[PDB]
Design a protein around this ligand. Structure first.
Ligand SMILES: Cc1cc2nc3c(=O)[nH]c(=O)nc-3n(C[C@H](O)[C@H](O)[C@H](O)COP(=O)(O)OP(=O)(O)OC[C@H]3O[C@@H](n4cnc5c(N)ncnc54)[C@H](O)[C@@H]3O)c2cc1C
Length: 500
């Protein structure tokens, strides 16, 4: 008896999962011949390549638990195999007599390299590998091909390419396993009945004092519930316009499906299909890029340019990226990183991020503009690394592509438009309720100066119980001075890049 193995990496879901559905159908169309191991590999190697914060570790723990639970409802289970894939797969290929391996493809450089070596081992041991592109709606390879070998570098060009492509068929959940016994314990399972159980919170979260509120539980079950909840107000959905959603509402002004889509707890293909059913139903609706479907197409757009550039996450060697002489300022980066810049709007956002692991799109704009071309002149790579640690939705292609946009390094070139750290939040939160919540030391400042507490006299700062420089920091820079200097620095950078 041989084993069929689905390998979860992303695509942490049962629904709309071709790689996993094929495994299950094959076992049911040939009962008695196959064992089935749906596995996730706790790969130590990814930690040398990315940072993971407490909150995102928790989301993954919750996700793996839900996936295991969902697999049990189909007379299977999740097997979580600790160790490096290059060492794990040769062992289990023999210990399990694996006939077929399926998995969902990924475009990240670490994933491509890792998958290539696995596919080399699978070819040696005579193991059939079947891969499926279901993490995105469109296959970046086909988009690049249709555009004659280059990725469209504008959203509009990208749209006009994918409009001519076939939308994939969205699958349901796989059928339950018919008369399948629990696979026999292998070398590891015999010395430890739990060697493959889902990790506990204690095993994955080493810094539990950094966990913030549990607001967005992981897992496919929670993904689908949140999408169904977001789709309930069809008018909100149909008339959604991303630029008009607030960054500093107390409740999220968008769906917060990003962590679920990042891990594949939610299929973007299913989400796209559910959105298209509401739009059909609602003749007055928005259109890309501002619509909700347009938001999914921004995800597709960045996955496609990212697939073409292995150095997408860095300035050097990145075909898309303007070369800009960012400066090193460790003390300013620490301040921004920990939300101690002295600009309350900025600090509010960075604390919401650290505490909760999600911030609104235009809140990311504000803190990203501040760090890079706006105020501090620190490389977007540094903002990417902090975002990578803290975001539940950390996504290699999106975190890069958007940082490049916000820094005016690619895709976006109107660097003379600069967000004000004082005025920008006021439009949608003139009372500063957001600031009061995430910077409570200022909670007694009246709206007139909660965004600019240095305009309160010393007497009033003592009266509000927050003296700048003691209870809340002084501004680390003066926006009115540095942003003008940085515009000139950007112009010079753009001239050098144009002459080369
Ligand atoms: C500096 C910076 C860094 C970012 N890093 C990430 C990241 O690491 N991971 C991430 O998922 N998004 C990232 N984004 C994009 C965007 O801000 C988030 O996708 C969005 O805030 C998710 O919130 P939401 O799910 O409520 O989005 P909604 O507006 O409800 O959109 C639905 C989905 O569309 C996609 N989407 C929406 N906006 C964008 C966008 N601008 N680019 C790409 N896809 C988009 C996401 O999958 C999102 O879940 C970043 C943006 C900026 C400016």
């Amino acid at each position: 008896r041989s084993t069929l193995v689905h390998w979860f990496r992303k695509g942490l879901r049962l629904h709309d999962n071709p790689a996993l559905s094929h495994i299950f159908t094959a076992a049911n169309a040939a009962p008695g011949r196959y064992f089935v191991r749906p596995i996730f590999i706790l790969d130590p190697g990814i930690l040398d390549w990315m940072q993971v914060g407490a909150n995102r570790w928790r989301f993954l723990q919750q996700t793996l638990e839900d996936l295991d639970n969902q697999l049990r409802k189909l007379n299977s289970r999740l097997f979580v195999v600790r160790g490096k894939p290059a060492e794990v797969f040769p062992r289990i290929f023999k210990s399990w007599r694996v006939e077929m391996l399926t998995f969902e493809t990924d475009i990240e450089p670490y994933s491509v390299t890792r998958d290539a070596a696995v596919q080399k081992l699978a070819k040696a041991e005579g193991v059939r590998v079947e891969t499926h592109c279901s993490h995105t709606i469109y296959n970046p390879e086909l988009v690049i091909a249709k555009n004659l070998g280059k990725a469209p570098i504008t959203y509009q060009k990208f749209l006009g390419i994918v409009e001519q492509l076939k939308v994939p068929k969205v699958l349901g959940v796989p059928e339950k396993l018919k008369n399948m016994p629990t696979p026999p314990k292998d070398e590891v399972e015999q010395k430890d009945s739990a060697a493959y159980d889902c990790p506990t919170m204690k095993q994955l979260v080493k810094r539990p004092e950094e966990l913030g509120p549990n607001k967005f539980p992981g897992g496919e079950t929670e993904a689908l519930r949140r999408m169904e909840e977001s789709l309930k107000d069809e008018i909100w959905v149909a008339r959604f316009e991303k630029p008009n959603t607030a960054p500093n509402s107390l409740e999220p002004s968008t769906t917060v499906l990003s962590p679920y889509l990042k891990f594949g707890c939610l299929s973007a293909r299913l989400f796209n299909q559910k959105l298209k059913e509401i739009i059909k139903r609602q003749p007055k609706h928005s259109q890309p890029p501002v619509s909700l479907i347009g938001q999914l197409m921004w995800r597709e757009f960045y996955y496609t340019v990212a697939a073409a550039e292995p150095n997408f996450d860095r300035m050097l060697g990145n075909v898309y990226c303007m070369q800009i002489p960012w400066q090193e300022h460790p003390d300013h980066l620490e301040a921004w990183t920990h939300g101690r810049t002295g600009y309350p709007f900025i600090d509010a956002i960075m604390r919401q991020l650290r505490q909760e692991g999600w911030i609104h799109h235009l809140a990311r704009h504000a803190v990203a503009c501040f760090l890079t071309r706006g105020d501090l002149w620190i490389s977007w790579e540094e903002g990417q690394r902090v975002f990578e640690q803290l975001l539940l939705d950390q996504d290699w292609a999106l975190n890069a592509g958007n940082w490049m946009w916000l820094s005016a390094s690619a895709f976006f070139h109107q660097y003379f438009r600069v967000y004000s750290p004082v005025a920008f939040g006021k439009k949608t939160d003139p009372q500063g309720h957001y600031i009061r919540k995430y910077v409570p030391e200022l909670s007694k400042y009246p709206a007139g100066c909660i965004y600019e507490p240095w305009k309160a006299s010393l007497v009033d700062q003592r009266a509000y119980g927050c003296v700048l420089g003691t209870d809340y920091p002084h501004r680390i820079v003066k926006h009115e001075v540095v942003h003008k200097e940085n515009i000139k620095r950007m112009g010079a950078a753009y001239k050098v890049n144009r002459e080369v």
